[PDB]
Structure formats: structure tokens, C-alpha cells
Amino acid sequence: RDPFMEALGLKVLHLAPGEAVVAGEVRADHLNLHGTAHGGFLYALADSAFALASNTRGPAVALSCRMDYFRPLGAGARVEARAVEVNLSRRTATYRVEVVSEGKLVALFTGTVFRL
Amino acid sequence: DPFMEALGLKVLHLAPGEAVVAGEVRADHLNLHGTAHGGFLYALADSAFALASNTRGPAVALSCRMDYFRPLGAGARVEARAVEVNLSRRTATYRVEVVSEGKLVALFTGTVFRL
Amino acid sequence: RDPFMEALGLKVLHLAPGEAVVAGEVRADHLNLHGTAHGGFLYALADSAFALASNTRGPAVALSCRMDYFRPLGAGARVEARAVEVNLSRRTATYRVEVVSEGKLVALFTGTVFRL
Amino acid sequence: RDPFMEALGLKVLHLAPGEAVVAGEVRADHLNLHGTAHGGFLYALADSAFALASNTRGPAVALSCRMDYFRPLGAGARVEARAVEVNLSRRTATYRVEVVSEGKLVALFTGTVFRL
Ligand SMILES: CCCCCC(=O)SCCNC(=O)CCNC(=O)[C@H](O)C(C)(C)COP(=O)(O)OP(=O)(O)OC[C@H]1O[C@@H](n2cnc3c(N)ncnc32)[C@H](O)[C@@H]1OP(=O)(O)O
Ligand SMILES: CCCCCC(=O)SCCNC(=O)CCNC(=O)[C@H](O)C(C)(C)COP(=O)(O)OP(=O)(O)OC[C@H]1O[C@@H](n2cnc3c(N)ncnc32)[C@H](O)[C@@H]1OP(=O)(O)O
Ligand SMILES: [Cl-]
């Protein structure tokens, strides 16, 4: 169980070795002053998939993450983050997470973990 | 800001090209390991980043980096301090330090496209 | 013609709209103190493909780039970087550049440009 | 100075615990196809100061590096990479490297190594 993911209404859809798919919906409480999905909401979603995918290999903590924003989203938008393992080392691992909504690539997340 | 209120974040300081936001790690901000969720610390840093950049005019985030140095438990008071590192016509870059009790918890680097 | 690419012995293997492949070989002058390819060389290779691919869309300048290192390479290693377009906006574009050697992902590069 | 630094004509101006400064000049063979300093040359400069600074703490390997470009440079420009330690832990370290030329912040480099 992940308290923050549930607080944000994010749901784990699928889990597997080095991979995970998390889904959610942009709600009124996830917006910024401009009426669009807060950058922190989209990151949390992708970061959640990243955390889940990396821990399927054992305990791991976030080291460095990059988030590239491409499309703004309004409330009501359905979103999915799919994390895929691009590198797995004895001490670190890196994952690419695509944030997608209605077939559109909303953002691209890249993250590396430190394997405890 | 709906999301900021949702996370219980508060704006402490706002000036030209800078912003300071504070919050506290609550039970609902923890991850599967019982520590502050990376998404919560980023959201905090991202908030200061958005506020600081917007003192220069409307802008949209392009690329952001977050480096985590220390984990935090529930109850920890945390703060995000944003400073402008570069300002141009169409872009701006900010450094945001996430600190808790004098310790650097994480480092955020973000660039925006100025509208 | 790209002077730095030439200085480093990098060759353009392919160039098409929003895409590029650049290849080279790790030489003695590309090594760090440990005897492996300097992070700057690998980055320069990835960056070159990134620059070429992004400019097929029109003059563009780099804004932010990320480089994640997975495997070290020694002199004599053949390496190639494939740049692919992940997002194309009117004012910006983002590319993924896989750096490989013998079918293995040596490094991953992500870069965004400002479209003039 | 490792082989790549020598090839690029880079000089070490300062080296102390957790910090380093590397200087170089943009030569004709350091230019991109646009006639300005190649993004890979500026990064190699930053990456060199980064590598020197991190290894003052002992052997370390680069994991993730970010490079943000702010201003273009022409041939003849004197440039410096000034690296400072922002975090130091048992198994990792992160450094901020400012790339400056003639009093201007040309680029910002952020990088994290894994300490061996
Ligand atoms: C987000 C979803 C869950 C997935 C997991 C996450 O991403 S959770 C949120 C995002 N990520 C994080 O919080 C990771 C933070 N980073 C770290 O903990 C570390 O940098 C690291 C494990 C990657 C590397 O640490 P090292 O192996 O080098 O070991 P080191 O002992 O030097 O630890 C570094 C610093 O963290 C502290 N620290 C480590 N474990 C701690 C703990 N359980 N409780 C309190 N503090 C702790 C140390 O005291 C030190 O702070 P001092 O020097 O001040 O004494
Ligand atoms: C390496 C591959 C080559 C392909 C392109 C690259 O990636 S080259 C290497 C990597 N990238 C860079 O160096 C990117 C540098 N960044 C920039 O030029 C800029 O920040 C930018 C275009 C992204 C955004 O600038 P803005 O749109 O905000 O406008 P702004 O007016 O503030 O920028 C003014 C500065 O840029 C200059 N400038 C303007 N047009 C220029 C041009 N066509 N060629 C060179 N330089 C130019 C001005 O002279 C001044 O430099 P002075 O104050 O010196 O007079
Ligand atoms: Cl990054």
C-alpha cells in the first residue's frame, strides 16, 4: 500500500519484473491556478510507476529523476504511466515512464534508482 | 492553487524571480516504504518553481530534474527555496533546494518556456 | 560538416526527418584516467545525433539534456547513437538517443530543443 | 589530465576536496555545424571538472548528468567549468558545475556519481 498514491487516487493496474502500469484521473484538487494538471501530479503518477517497477527487483530508492512535459491536461482526463526497465545493474537501475492520455504522450519520465 | 491546498503547502515568501514554499510530511504523503513519497517532495519543489517563474510572467514547465539525498519520515517539516539561475526571452531556469532542519533533502532543477 | 564530430572521428550513418544515426570508435584520445571512454565522448556522440535529428525540422537549439551511463567502454569499442523523436511541438521538440555497442545499451540520452 | 582532456586542450586551474575548475578555449575544431561551440564540447568541459571534483573523494563512476544550455559561444571564447559539491553520502555524491565565459553563465551542469 502506498498512502500518497491512494491520496491522489492513483491505482496500480499491473505489476511484473521490472515493470508497472499505474492509472489515475486528473481531479479538481490536482489543478494549478491555470486550471491544468499540476506538474507535481503528473510527476507523482510517473514516479509511482517508477517506484513500483524498480522495487520488483528488491529494495530501491529514487536517486535522480527527469520529467519532460509535452501536453497540458484538464480535470477529467484519464492518464496512465507505464514504467519500463532500460537498464538493470547490481547497484542501480534506470526506467523510462511514459505518461499517456487518450493515446497522446503527455510527458516522459526518466529515473534511476539506488538498489539497497 | 488547488493542488497546493490539497497537499497542505503554504507560500512563505514571494519576490521577483524567487519563492519559498513550506509544508509538512503527513501520513498521506508517505510511500510504500513509509517515507516521504518522491512525488510529494517534487510537488513541493515544483510549487516554488512555478511561483518563482511566474513572477516574470506566464510560463510553462519544460524539463525538470530532481535529485534525492535524504529520506524523510512523517512529521518532518520541509521547505522548498527557489532561485532564478537564468532568465531569457523565451526560457528561464531555476534551482530549488528542498531542506528540512538545515539538511539538504533534495535538489530540483527546472526550466520553463516563457509565454 | 561538424568540426567537433570530425575531430572525434564520428560519422553520420543516416539522416532523415526527425531522425539520425551517428557512429564512431572509442580511441586512445577519448579515454579518461581509468582507461575507459570519457563521459564527455559518449555524451558528444549522443548529443551529435540529437543535434542532427532536431535540425532536420529546422534550426533548433538545445535547452536541456540528460545523460545516464550504464556500461563503460574501452578503446577499440565500436559505438553508435540512434536519435528518435518522442515529441514534436511548434516551439520545442524532445528526442531519445540510445547509445549502443554490440547490441547493448551503453547509455541513454534525452534532450529537448527550442525551435527557432 | 586524462587523454580526452588533453585532446580538447583543457587545463586544470583548481583542485581541492569536493571541487575543481577546468578551463579551455573554443577552437575551430570544437564548433558545431552552426559555427558555435558544440554542446558536446561544453559538456566535456563540465564533465571533466565534475569527474575531477568527485574523485577527490575517492574512486567514483558517473550515473546521471544534466546539462542546461543558456548562451551560445563562438570560436576564441575562453570558458571555465567550476564544480562544487552539493551532496556527499557514503555511496553517492552530486555536483553542480557552472560553465562560464567572459562573465556570463553559459550553461549549468548537474551530475551524480556512485562512489566505489
Ligand atoms: C517514492 C516511492 C518509494 C520508492 C523509494 C523512494 O524513492 S522514497 C523518496 C525519494 N528518495 C529518497 O528519499 C532517497 C534519499 N536518498 C538516500 O536515502 C540516500 O542518498 C541513498 C540510499 C540513495 C544513498 O545513501 P548511502 O547508501 O550513501 O548511505 P548514507 O548512510 O551515507 O545515507 C545518506 C544520508 O541519508 C541518511 N539516511 C539513510 N537512511 C535513513 C533512514 N532510514 N532514516 C533517516 N535517515 C536516513 C543518512 O543518515 C545520511 O544523512 P546525513 O548525512 O545527514 O546523516
Ligand atoms: C551543438 C549543435 C548545434 C545546434 C544548436 C546547438 O545546440 S548549440 C550548443 C548548445 N546550445 C546552446 O548554446 C543554446 C544557447 N541558447 C540560446 O541561444 C538561447 O537561450 C535560446 C535561443 C534557446 C533562447 O533564447 P531567447 O529566445 O530567450 O532569446 P534571447 O534574446 O534572450 O537570447 C540572446 C542571446 O542569444 C543570442 N543569439 C540570438 N540569436 C542567435 C543566433 N542565431 N545564433 C547565435 N546566437 C544568437 C544573442 O546574441 C544573445 O547572446 P549574447 O549575449 O552572447 O550576445
Ligand atoms: Cl535531467
TrEMBL record, chains A, C, D:
GO molecular function terms attached to this record: acyl-CoA hydrolase activity
Binding site for CoA: A62, Y69, F70, S89, R90, R91
Thioesterase domain boundaries: 34-104
Keyword Hydrolase assigned: yes
Keywords: Hydrolase
PANTHER family hit by this protein: ACYL-COENZYME A THIOESTERASE PAAI
NCBIfam families for the chain: PaaD, unchar_dom_1
Name of the protein this chain belongs to: Phenylacetic acid degradation protein PaaI
Highest classification ranks of the organism: Bacteria, Thermotogati, Deinococcota, Deinococci, Thermales
